[PDB]
Each structure stands twice: as C-alpha cells, then as structure tokens.
Amino acid sequence: AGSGLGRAYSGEGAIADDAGNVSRNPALITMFDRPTFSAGAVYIDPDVNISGTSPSGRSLKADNIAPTAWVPNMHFVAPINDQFGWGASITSNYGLATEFNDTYAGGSVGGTTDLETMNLNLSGAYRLNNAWSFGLGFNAVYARAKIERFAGDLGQLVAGQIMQSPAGQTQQGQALAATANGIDSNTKTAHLNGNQWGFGWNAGILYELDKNNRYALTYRSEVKIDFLTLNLPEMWEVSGYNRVDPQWAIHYSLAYTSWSKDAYRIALGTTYYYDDNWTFRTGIAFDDSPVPAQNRSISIPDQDRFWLSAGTTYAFNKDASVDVGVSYMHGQSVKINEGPYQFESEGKAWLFGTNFNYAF
Ligand SMILES: CCCCCCCCOCCOCCOCCOCCO
Ligand SMILES: CCCCCCCCOCCOCCOCCOCCO
Secondary structure: OOHHHHOOOOOOOOOOOOHHHHHOOHHHHHHOOOOEEEEEEEEEEEEEEEEOEOOOOOEOOEOOOOOOEEEEEEEEEEEEEOOEEEEEEEEOOOEEEEEOOOOOOOHHHOOEEEEEEEEEEEEEEEEOOOOEEEEEEEEEEEEEEEEEEEOOOHHHHHHHHHOOOHHHOOOOOHHHHHHHHOOOOOOEEEEEEEEEEEEEEEEEEEEEEEOOEEEEEEEEOOEEEEOOEEEEOEEEEEEEEEOOOOOEEEEEEEEEEEOOOOEEEEEEEEEEOOOOOOOEEEEEEEEOOOOOOOOOOOOOOOOOEEEEEEEEEEEEEOOEEEEEEEEEEEEOOEEEOOOOOOEEEEEEEEEEEEEEEEEO
16 A cells, blocks of 8 residues: 555554555544545566476466556545544455466366455544544455366376276276366366455554654454355554654564464564655565465465565655555465365565655
8 A cells, every 4th residue: 555565564553654554553543633645556466386297297387377466545534623533545455366277287276266355444533642542444345256267187187097997997987087088178167256245344542652652453353255255354463663763763563363274464664764855664574374284275375475675755745745665575485285286386576556645
C-alpha cells in the first residue's frame, strides 16, 4: 500500500504519516486532524522457478510460473469530533498466481492456481485521552478462485508400474499399461472456479507515549469464504514507532498468524525526514513459512523470504505528496516432495509502488 512498501512494512500499525495505515490499525484513526485521502498501486513482478525431473524421466522443469500483478489501494480517513474519527479503504491482503503449461509433467500438482482478494474496509475508532485510543473494523472480502489441474506423466507412471507386474504379460494386462500411458497430459483433472464474499472484523489499540513515540496491538479476524471453503487466517500484530530525532525515526513490528500450522513475520525499518519536501525510508523483513517442509506445493509459492526496501516521499506542499516505493524479495531455495514427484523451487521478486495523498 505505498510508502509501507519502501519500509518493508515495518511498524505498519503505529506509523501515521499518511492515511494508508488506518487500514492496518483502526486505532490509528485518532491520529488525523483533517480528512486525508491516498490512492495508488504496487506493481508486482515475481520469478518462481520449479526444477528437477520425474520418475517418468520427463522434465519437471517450469520457468516463471508466477505472473505479474498490479495491486491498487485506496484509503480515506477523517475526524468526526475531538473524540471520534472514521475511515474506509480498498486494498488486498491475500493472493496467489501460479501457471504451468497444461502439458507439464507434474500437471496434476501444478496446473493453474489463481486467487484474488479484494478487501473493502470501513471502521472507526475512539480516542480515550492523550495516550490511549481504540478502533474496530468491518471487512468485506471479494474472492475469485480459479483452480486447474491435469494428469501430467501420471498415466505413464501408472503404466510403467504395471509393466513391472505379472499383468505385464498381456491379456488385457498390457493393454492396460498402454491405456493408462495413452492418457494425455492436458486431460483436465480438476476445474473449480468461483466468486464469493467473505466477512471479517479487525480491531486495534493505539498507545502513544507522546507525539513522538507510540506502540500498538492489532487483531485481524479469520475470514471464511465458502464456494469448497477458503479460510483467510486470523492475525495478531505489535508495532512501534520512535521519532528518535527531528529527522530520524524507527518502526518495527512482529506479526503472528495461525492458519488453523502457523507463521510469523518480523520487520524493522527507519525513515529519514531530510527536509519539508523529501523523506527517505529503508526496510528489512523476514516472514517465516506457515507450511511444513513436507506439506508444501510447487502450486502455492511461499517459503522463508527476506525483504530489502527503499522508498521516497516528495511533498509538493503541506496538503499533497506522492510516495514511491521499491522492494526486492529473495527466496530461500527449497525442496518439495509433492505427490510421486520431487521438485525444487527458487523465486525472488521485485515490487514497484506509488501513492499520492491529499489533505482537505
Ligand atoms: C511473490 C509475491 C509477493 C507477495 C507480496 C506482495 C506484497 C504486497 O501485498 C500484496 C497484497 O495482496 C495480494 C498479492 O498479490 C498476489 C501474489 O503474487 C502472485 C505470485 O504467485
Ligand atoms: C535497537 C533498535 C532496533 C529497534 C528494535 C527495538 C524493538 C524491540 O522489540 C520489540 C519486540 O516485539 C516486536 C518485534 O521485534 C523487534 C523488531 O525487529 C528487529 C530486527 O530484526
């Protein structure tokens, strides 16, 4: 969602320099004087690459299986009265794109895999005094799932096996291996695609030690989406912002998620306010995988990944400004043993992001 991309999303739940954050922590609403609006997008360009071979001897190599993506974000925030404020946003919190050929040998465990999420958020917060503040949010999730699968060298495998058995010596015995082996890769073995809505509620608590230092604890509820039933995980997060100097600040957060398996994310970053116009941000983060070294899938790319980030912010003048963010993710090369297959998945990625914000 913009600036956050250049800070590796470090302390997203305590930073308040632009309305983007309210969607991450509703309590942060009591942090804005005048209505603020921000919009933009993040262009996502991956590089997932499966490798290795099959017991069929056929290649299980698949270059670039993760498509590019453009992700929009739009946040609006405004005060109501000295003790209340409200806000809305349109973003995306989950997704996933994977595409192999339909003739791929592991076609059964790696056909087409799409999943887009649109989160519609509305929420409010109440300021309890100079220090504490609290927020509650409702969420609308539009999910579009697409899941294709074929039988790669499956019939061959079935067949080669048979050929190692007595039924080998004919009598509808060899005709068998043949019939199995005479099965096309592109023989679609699974096509489920649908659209449905999800509903969840998130909340937050914002504690500030002063206009220069604050901490937080946010909570994101699980969201079940029924088509097959897809569950977006519930989340917990703690973040801190320290305005250590007029020109230097620090932000960091620890996030926890339990996919009813579980994983965590850690990020630390620092911004620098050179002057009234310019602002600079750097960030590092690591998100530990929620999937056991044996329950992975070349289909769903994820794996202990790291993040390097850098963003900049030009303020045209007191009311408006634009954010530009860069972010590179490198992935730990792993070993997957899905089905009768065994692959190897590497994958890095680049993120470009821009956002313009305006005050009324
Ligand atoms: C390799 C993908 C990196 C995912 C991080 C993007 C970070 C920002 O937020 C995105 C939020 O919403 C959904 C993401 O897009 C779908 C995933 O990319 C497709 C590759 O399989
Ligand atoms: C010493 C300066 C670095 C700032 C970190 C202080 C943050 C202290 O710990 C908070 C513990 O709970 C949340 C997350 O972990 C901290 C941030 O990650 C740091 C480097 O990987």
